[PDB]
Nucleic acid binder design. Structure first.
Ligand SMILES: [Zn+2]
Ligand SMILES: [Zn+2]
Ligand SMILES: [Zn+2]
Ligand SMILES: [Zn+2]
Lengths: 1702, 150
RNA sequence: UAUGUGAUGGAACCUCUCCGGAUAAUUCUAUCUCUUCUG
């Protein structure tokens, strides 16, 4: 035999059919795609490689030979041929089947020459082998003259791989071409790898075929020609090369199914997604899961080499905070930023061929699946249409016949297609919903199927045909469309200059009735860039000398780029242009050699090309019009996913695209413009709510419905010029405490736009020529409405952003006022005009009490209708306003110049001063709920107050000392007992140091003139006589106790001589007393029967002691007499003073001075009892002693009382025990009493070194005092030893005799200054808890929550007060409670549980109820309309059940303020614009110099709410005054003056505008009832007496402004002021119901004060220095005038001062 | 008629608000998010977050009552309604029926792995699978009913 | 791995419908801190 190898070389790609079982080889899936490469599957491993059977090659060679012989009239260089048979046969698709392979096209004919028969077949018949007569013969052992073998991949004969590893599956559809919707689709496989391209096989010729040399030469010549003319095989473009003619397993057809190979490391990605979801639900941030699932793909695009994820917003001065998403803790890894990087590094190390892009893609898919599994309702899902795949094939029933027309010319055309608009080619696999299709190496792909479909669509439009191709019919379809597409060959193309990943675009669907998004309306898609170059190749083989006119027309249309190529043509995508067109013609009848030299240019590039004309054509069915719109305000459009990766940290950032021919480009997406046009048309024609299923209305005709297509294409609008951005800041201000609720700083980067410097938008709109007139008129009206300024561009339109046609300076200002009416007069408001007094200082702010009735409505006016008078008449228009300042205004900017003291400039838009609309919106809204008694739109309902426990107060404190149990259930807690402890002392040494610690100063003495001073006090002469020994003693004392004791001993002690004093005293009458038996019943000796017998003679007054004794001896009988004697101990006996008693006392050798005091204590009335006389004598002695001590020495040191030499001090100071301390297990300590055993609480812990019982140990610091003095200088150190004596008077706890503050010597630590002016510390003894046998008690769950809030309160307060970190009192905890923490537990009866946990005995109380329910019960519900369930701990149950859209909102509806201004779900109906100035630079205050403001501090909630039962006072308002002049004068002052203001880090420097400066702005409204419009006009324009308050530094008098209303443009509708006033009055009367108290108070808070003699300041806590210095001080005010109980008053009453001018 | 009493008629799957009169949040929750809310203005209302007895944490027992109620409407009053009305009732029933089955089938696999260590106790499986089979019985009836119309 | 007198699969656009909307004044004064020893 002879072997002639063949080579099939593919150029771009080809198609493959999968593997099928033998019994299933005649199904529809196999008959379709019968002309494609097959797939192998072996028994050993079920893997194989593609191959090409020889029958395809034989058919292609036969077709090429037929064409060649027809073209040459049956003579190809001496190869005379005859037509053959081409009929009969018994061909079968498969051997084990009956499918039968038959022709469907027409065979070509040529005249017959020479003789051809069985003995000497012609070359054509020899190739065909028709004389073999294979009928009825199997031919399995029968030879063949010419045989075609298989074709396999060259260089990969033995390589298995898999179907999913070599090929990819695409779904391709068919388009109706009448309505641009799909009808049928099927599945394909494609191979684009460069390795699997070359295929090599062979042709085997037996000896019979090689009859002689001439026959073989002719056969080789014909085969070579046919191989030259072969063009396409297996669905791809190829060229065949014929070599020199010189030479010499099982498919596993059993039952087995296997698919879904998935991918490597899929389980790892699923586990990662699960972990991330678990972390997100742990921190309850599941509302950002889809945002993260798109952010991971953004990271895929954003590369890892220069990645820097954002951070917090830099709270306080310069310290960044933690990002809300990037700083999520995951499995003890605080930083998700580092966790993601570490995970990627581990994945890269573990697996090969792993990069950033693949990891991000897999992670994104995993997170998308996890989000769809867990967080439902996050996306929209009915898809009935777009199904039913269809495949059809039908064997012909008749003979197709023969033809006589064939090709004679071939054309090749080159060119380039460049995308001038972003494109989209959808990629969908039956088994990240939509993605742009691309090659496996990253190159973007433009498939040939799309190109052929577009070409046939355009040629069908040109020819005006209605072909659908009807899938498989009984006969070829014919008609010019198919007759010309039967001879056009188009190559597959790939992008040459782009390989980067594409971008992502998002779309939403709004809810017309509410103006916001739907429940799950959110879609995403991948979008290619603009500027991608795609090669173009065309091949036409037909029998004509010129191109068909339809093709030239289509090329003319393509050269102008007037048609769309990609999928989403509705929003202007897929526009391409054709450039550099060239062509060449070949004549196959006479120039065969020149063609065969290059094989048509698919083997060697063509040398010489000819230029084509393609003049022009204007027949295309689309019309282009240009649109230009100028925007006169800053423009913002949110890109939430991009803002999470930009290192700038901005909250909201604009959308940008890319351009390949050139940098970021700012634009508004064409989807937004299409939505605006559709909404405008629907609102104008009231078609926004009609059902659109088989509707054919204007809206369903311009833009189409679900079952049809649209007639309009909207291109993107690109900003022209060099735009620049700016940082704009925002915050939410609470209405109870004016000031930011929390860190809600919001940032954005809008493109700056000004009426003088507008922003220009340019774009294109394409409309079909078949659109009827009415649709065009509606489009024109919508365009005019948009250009007039009825629809803002982008978001934040209610704050003045993106306004069209906004020139507020065209009007000639607003002189005076029009449409003016008085609400106070018509509502007979007293207003309490009153009169102000100069001699008082008033508060800078007051509180306005809440109302009683809140009028809510379930159904507010909708947005989908321009005007529907269902209940009332609705208006829409604009109001012209003007603003001027009565006092300097401060509006700080976002940029500062400085590092320590940040100076600020005025707000401006690139050098043009202006006022943002947010400030005006806020102040107008606040005045609105002030008037209409609406809800509190901003309110911190989620906050619990703390307060502080007073040391003493009917029990002041009832907390027990306890310790946490072991590592059991955390509920259990065991009580304990407390004793003293070491580790906090001053010094340990011998008694000499202790006795030398004193004698610093302040030694008391005695001097002679004290006697002279006493002599002027009418003191007794005996007192002076006894003091003379004290005068001549020449002794210096140091303690009060020893001096008093010595005085008593030397002068004479009454207690020393009590016995004879009592004996000599006269004894009188005896009377019974109930107190006697009350305080004598302690002893059990006296029986109760004896007590009753004695009580029987109640109130019996006897003459003397003898009568009482006789009665006691007589009445009581038959019992022991010892109790009778004991009863006499507590009898009331009168005491009388007589001369004889005094004489007897004097004769007892007692000091004469005692008798002198006795005589001076003469009293005629008899004493109630001897104890009363003794108490009176003691009181007189104390008074005399105090009077004597008042005239003591004048050292001026306040001689201390005896404290230091006490044994307690010595035993506390000697025992240091700084070391030898252990913090685990039971301790080993003993109670070291000071040789005195009286009761408990007097002991210590000696820590080894009685019964020796000890356990546990504690370690913490104590309080730091505040006192300014110099004791021992020194500096802070870790030695924590005391160095100091004396200072301040310690308040005594309880009293032995009398409770009063008294000076004492106390140790102290050196001040931290080494305002750093008054620091100290007092701690002397520490505490330890010993174990006791107490049953464990369960702990309530709320206790730990209270503890966490308490710990956060300490951290925040310590950071606020700037206390040293080293000596922070109380060691707390990082989180939760540990089994072994030592805390003080509080126990009540209750249910035998513990409700609250505290770290020490004196701490913060922490409340039990939230602020949300502290509004008084006698006031209507003032909580926000949009409520939060978290007031209880049941939000988790709702989240698990998912019923969250029902429990929200007030059950009655929306308050008037929330209706007019809008809520989160509704949309506001009033818009506030930017206020500009007629001149670019208005005059500035202080000659343009910066003003150094004083320190501004945060409002303190715990001033109007002292106790636990306090209720919310109301809204906070600021009064008007003239305190700005003092602030200005204090600034601009020389530094040496102590009255100047220092430039600290906590201060701030700003700029202010002078008075009488005018600004102009406009307010735009829509769908307003007339009463709302009247109330809005009244709020904007108050009475001339009052004024507004705006800007910063309100408490200092800054920012008094007045707004004047000039005109109302209500449009064509008629409006009158009388109706507005009447409606406003009716609404106010309906709301307030003739209630004026709150209204009078509000109008008193808004009164304007111009007088310079009225001073308002703050109490300036505490008063120092001598003299009076005002009643200033928050404590001193609370002591006498305000008081905690009455403080819920004098603050709700406006204009009330606290103190007078000194 | 011993039903939710919120739907105006099975002919037009609408509910004119007034569904908050019912006490069960499950009844209210479902009625708002697969039926158009009628009216020409937005509706804002709610309940008091103090409802005891919990919310039963499941949806499947509730919208299953929609399936039986909607199917019986066609079998009793479906002849008078027009072609558009007939398609709307059946198509809506299919959409809610498959959602419950998807939840139940997903529970089956996650529990079929758990039951291996639970002593092959199929008592819980039998109750759930029977409901899944009962839904499949409704699955066949719905598609067959619409196939007769087309 | 295909069978020889018969292969328009270059015989089919994953197409169509959907405003990344909506709420918010860059602002503002009263405490902080626990163990003292019989007074
Ligand atoms: Zn022949
Ligand atoms: Zn046709
Ligand atoms: Zn319509
Ligand atoms: Zn409200």
């Amino acid at each position: 035999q002879h072997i002639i190898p063949l080579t099939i070389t593919f150029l771009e790609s080809f198609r493959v059919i999968e593997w099928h079982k033998s019994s299933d080889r005649n199904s529809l899936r196999f008959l379709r795609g019968y002309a494609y490469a097959r797939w192998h599957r072996s028994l050993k491993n079920n893997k194989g490689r593609p191959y090409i059977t020889g029958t395809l090659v034989r058919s292609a060679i036969i077709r090429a030979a037929e064409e060649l012989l027809w073209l040459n009239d049956g003579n190809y260089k001496g190869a005379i041929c005859c037509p053959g048979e081409f009929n009969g046969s018994n061909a079968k698709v498969f051997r084990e089947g009956k499918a039968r392979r038959l022709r469907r096209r027409q065979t070509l004919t040529w005249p017959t020459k020479c003789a051809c028969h069985e003995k000497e077949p012609c070359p054509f018949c020899l190739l065909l082998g028709r004389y073999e007569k294979s009928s009825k013969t199997s031919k399995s052992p029968v030879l063949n003259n010419v045989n075609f073998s298989n074709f396999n991949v060259l260089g990969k004969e033995k390589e298995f791989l898999n179907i999913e590893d070599v090929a990819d599956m695409r779904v391709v559809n068919r388009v109706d071409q009448q309505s641009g919707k799909a009808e049928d689709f099927f599945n394909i496989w494609e191979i684009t790898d460069g390795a699997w391209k070359i295929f090599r096989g062979e042709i085997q010729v037996s000896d019979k075929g090689w009859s002689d040399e001439e026959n073989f030469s002719k056969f080789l010549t014909l085969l070579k020609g046919a191989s030259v003319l072969v063009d396409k095989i297996s669905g791809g473009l190829c060229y065949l090369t014929l070599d020199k003619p010189e030479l010499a397993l099982e498919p596993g057809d059993d039952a087995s199914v296997l698919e879904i190979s998935r991918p490597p490391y899929w389980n790892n990605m699923l586990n990662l997604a699960g972990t991330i979801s678990e972390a997100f639900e742990r921190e309850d941030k599941l509302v950002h899961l889809r945002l993260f699932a798109d952010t991971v793909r953004e990271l895929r695009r954003s590369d890892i080499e220069t990645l820097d994820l954002p951070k917090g917003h830099a709270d306080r001065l310069g310290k960044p905070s933690d990002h809300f998403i990037w700083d999520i803790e995951i499995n003890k890894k605080v930083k998700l930023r580092n966790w993601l990087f570490w995970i990627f590094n581990e994945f890269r190390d573990t697996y090969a061929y792993f990069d950033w892009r693949t990891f991000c893609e897999a992670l994104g898919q995993a997170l998308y699946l996890e989000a769809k599994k867990q967080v439902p309702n996050q996306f929209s899902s009915e898809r009935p249409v777009g199904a039913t795949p269809a495949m059809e094939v039908k064997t012909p029933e008749h003979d197709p016949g023969r033809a006589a027309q064939g090709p004679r010319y071939e054309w090749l055309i080159k060119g380039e297609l460049v995308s001038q608009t972003p494109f989209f080619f959808g990629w969908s696999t039956e088994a990240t919903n939509l993605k742009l299709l691309a090659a496996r190496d990253g190159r973007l792909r433009l498939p040939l199927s799309v190109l052929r479909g577009i070409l046939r669509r355009d040629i069908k439009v040109v020819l005006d045909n209605k072909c659908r191709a009807e899938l498989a019919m009984k006969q070829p379809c014919s008609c010019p469309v198919c007759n010309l597409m039967k001879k056009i060959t188009i190559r597959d193309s790939f992008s040459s200059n782009y390989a980067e990943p594409p971008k992502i675009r998002h779309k939403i669907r709004l809810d017309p009735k509410s103006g916001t998004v739907a429940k799950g309306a959110l879609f995403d898609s991948e979008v290619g860039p603009r500027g991608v170059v795609f090669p173009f190749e065309l091949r036409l083989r037909s029998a004509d000398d010129t191109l068909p006119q339809a093709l030239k027309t289509v090329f003319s249309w393509w050269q102008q780029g007037t048609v769309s190529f990609s999928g989403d043509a509705g929003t202007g995508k897929g526009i391409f242009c054709l450039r550099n067109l060239k062509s060449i013609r070949w004549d196959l009848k006479t120039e065969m050699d020149k063609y065969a030299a290059t094989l048509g240019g698919r083997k060697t590039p063509v040398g010489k090309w000819d230029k084509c004309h393609i003049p022009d054509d204007k027949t295309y069915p689309w019309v282009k019009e240009t649109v230009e719109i100028s925007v006169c305000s800053p423009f913002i459009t949110k890109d939430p996913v991009n803002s999470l990766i930009d290192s700038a940290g901005y909250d909201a950032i604009c959308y940008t695209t890319v351009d390949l021919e050139k940098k970021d480009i700012y634009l508004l997406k064409g989807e937004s413009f299409r939505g605006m046009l559709r909404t405008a048309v629907g609102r104008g024609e009231n078609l926004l709510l009609r059902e659109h299923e088989d509707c054919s209305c204007t809206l369903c005709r311009i833009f189409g419905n679900e079952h049809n297509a649209g007639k309009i294409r909207v291109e993107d609008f690109i900003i022209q010029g060099e735009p620049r951005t700016k940082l704009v800041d925002r915050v939410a201000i609470d209405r109870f405490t004016a000031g930011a609720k929390d860190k809600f700083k919001f940032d954005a980067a809008p493109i700056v736009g000004t009426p003088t410097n507008k922003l220009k938008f340019r774009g294109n709109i394409w409309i079909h020529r078949d659109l009827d007139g009415l649709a065009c008129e509606s489009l024109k009206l919508a365009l005019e409405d948009i250009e007039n300024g009825l629809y803002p561009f982008g978001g934040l339109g209610n704050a003045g952003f993106g306004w069209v046609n906004y020139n507020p300076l065209s009007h000639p200002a607003q002189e005076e006022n029009k449409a003016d009416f008085s609400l106070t007069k018509k509502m007979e408001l007293n207003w309490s005009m009153k009169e102000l007094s100069t001699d008082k200082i008033y508060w800078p702010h007051y509180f306005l009490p809440f109302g009683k009735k809140v009028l809510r409505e379930k159904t507010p006016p909708s947005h989908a209708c321009i005007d529907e008078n269902e209940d009332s008449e609705l208006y829409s228009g604009k109001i012209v306003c003007t603003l001027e300042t009565r006092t300097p205004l401060i509006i700080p900017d976002s940029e500062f110049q400085g590092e320590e003291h940040k100076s600020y400039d005025f707000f401006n838009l690139n050098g043009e001063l202006c006022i943002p609309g947010s400030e005006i919106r806020g102040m107008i809204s606040s005045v609105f709920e002030a008037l209409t008694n609406s809800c509190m739109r901003i309110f911190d309902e989620k906050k619990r107050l703390s307060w502080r426990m007073n040391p003493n107060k009917n029990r002041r404190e009832l907390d027990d000392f306890i310790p946490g149990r072991v590592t059991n259930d955390r509920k259990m807690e065991e009580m304990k007992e407390y004793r003293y402890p070491f580790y906090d002392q001053a010094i340990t040494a011998n008694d000499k140091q202790n006795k030398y610690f004193d004698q610093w100063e302040a030694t008391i003495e005695l001097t002679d003139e004290s006697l002279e001073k006493l002599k002027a006090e009418k003191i007794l002469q005996s007192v002076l006589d006894a003091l003379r020994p004290l005068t001549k003693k020449k002794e210096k004392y140091k303690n009060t106790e020893t001096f008093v004791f010595d005085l008593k001993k030397f002068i004479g002690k009454i207690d020393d001589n009590q016995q004879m004093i009592s004996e000599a005293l006269e004894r009188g009458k005896v009377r019974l007393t109930g107190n006697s038996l009350k305080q004598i019943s302690k002893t059990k000796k006296i029986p109760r029967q004896i007590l009753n017998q004695l009580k029987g003679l109640k109130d019996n007054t006897y003459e003397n002691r003898e009568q009482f004794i006789s009665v006691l001896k007589t009445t009581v009988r038959g019992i022991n007499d010892e109790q009778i004697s004991l009863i006499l101990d507590n009898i009331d006996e009168d005491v009388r003073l007589t001369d004889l008693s005094l004489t007897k006392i004097r004769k007892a050798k007692v000091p004469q001075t005692l008798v002198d005091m006795l005589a001076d204590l003469k009293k005629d009335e008899p004493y109630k009892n001897e104890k009363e006389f003794l108490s009176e004598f003691k009181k007189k002695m104390g008074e005399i002693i105090g009077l004597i001590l008042k005239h003591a020495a004048k050292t001026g040191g306040d001689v201390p009382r005896y404290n230091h030499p006490t044994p307690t001090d010595k035993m506390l100071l000697s025992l240091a025990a700084y070391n030898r301390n252990h913090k685990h297990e039971n301790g080993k300590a003993e109670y070291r009493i000071v040789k005195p055993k009286h009761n408990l609480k007097v002991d210590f812990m000696f820590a080894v070194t009685y019964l020796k019982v000890s356990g546990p140990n504690k370690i913490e610091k104590v309080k730091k005092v505040n006192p300014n003095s110099v004791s021992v200088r020194d500096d802070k150190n870790q030695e924590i030893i005391h160095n100091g004596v004396y200072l301040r008077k310690i308040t005594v706890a309880n009293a032995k005799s009398k409770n009063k503050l008294r000076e004492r010597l106390v140790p102290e630590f050196a001040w931290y200054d080494k305002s750093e002016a008054a620091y100290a510390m007092t701690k002397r003894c520490e505490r330890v808890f010993v174990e006791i046998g107490a049953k464990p008690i369960p702990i309530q769950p709320s206790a730990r929550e209270k503890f966490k809030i308490l710990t956060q309160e300490y951290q925040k307060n310590a950071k606020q007060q700037k206390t040293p970190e080293a000596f922070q009192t109380i060691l707390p905890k990082d989180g939760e409670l540990r089994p072994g923490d030592l805390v003080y537990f509080r126990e009540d009866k209750k249910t035998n549980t513990v409700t609250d946990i505290i770290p020490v005995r004196i701490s913060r109380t922490v409340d039990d109820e939230v602020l949300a329910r502290k509004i008084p019960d006698d006031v209507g519900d003032v909580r926000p309309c949009v409520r939060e369930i978290l007031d209880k701990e049941k939000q988790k149950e709702i989240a698990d059940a998912g019923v969250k859209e029902v429990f929200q909102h007030h059950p009655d509806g929306l308050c008037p303020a929330c209706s007019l201004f809008g809520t989160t779900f509704y949309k506001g109906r009033i818009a506030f614009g930017f206020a500009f100035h007629k001149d670019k630079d208005p005059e500035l205050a202080n000659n343009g110099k910066h003003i150094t403001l004083p320190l501004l501090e945060r409002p303190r909630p715990t001033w109007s709410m002292p106790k636990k039962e306090s209720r919310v006072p109301g809204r906070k308002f600021y009064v008007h005054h003239q305190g700005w002049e003092r602030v200005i004068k204090h600034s601009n002052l020389d530094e040496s003056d102590p009255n100047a203001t220092k430039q600290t880090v906590n201060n701030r420097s700003v700029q202010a505008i002078k008075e009488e400066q005018k600004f102009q702005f406009e307010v735009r409204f829509e769908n307003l009832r007339e009463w709302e419009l009247g109330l809005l006009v009244y709020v904007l324009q108050l009475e001339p007496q009052f004024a507004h308050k705006l800007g910063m530094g309100k408490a200092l008098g800054f920012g008094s402004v007045r707004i004047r209303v000039g005109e109302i443009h209500s449009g064509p509708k008629e409006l009158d002021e009388s109706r507005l006033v009447s409606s406003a009055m009716k609404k106010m009367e309906e709301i307030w119901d003739r209630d004026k108290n709150v209204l009078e108070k509000l109008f008193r808070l808004l009164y304007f004060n111009e007088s310079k003699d009225i001073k308002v300041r703050y109490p300036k806590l505490q008063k120092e220095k001598e003299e009076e210095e005002e009643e200033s001080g928050y404590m001193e005010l609370a002591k006498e005038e305000y008081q905690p109980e009455q403080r819920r008053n004098k603050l709700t009453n406006p204009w009330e001062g606290w103190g007078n001018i000194l | 008629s011993s039903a939710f009493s919120g739907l105006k008629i099975p002919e037009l799957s609408v509910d004119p608000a007034e569904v908050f009169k019912s006490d069960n949040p499950q009844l209210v929750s479902v009625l708002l998010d697969e039926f158009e809310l009628q009216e020409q203005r937005p509706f804002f209302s709610g309940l008091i977050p103090e409802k005891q007895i919990n919310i039963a944490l499941k949806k499947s027992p509730q919208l299953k009552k929609l399936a039986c109620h909607l199917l019986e409407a066609y079998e009793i009053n479906g002849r008078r309604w027009k072609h558009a009305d007939r398609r709307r009732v059946l198509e809506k029933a299919i959409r809610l029926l498959e959602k419950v089955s998807n939840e139940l089938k997903g529970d089956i696999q996650k529990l079929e792995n758990n039951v291996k260590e639970s002593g092959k106790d199929s008592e819980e499986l039998n109750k759930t699978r029977e409901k899944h089979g009962e839904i499949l019985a409704d699955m066949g009836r719905a598609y067959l009913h619409r196939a007769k119309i087309i």
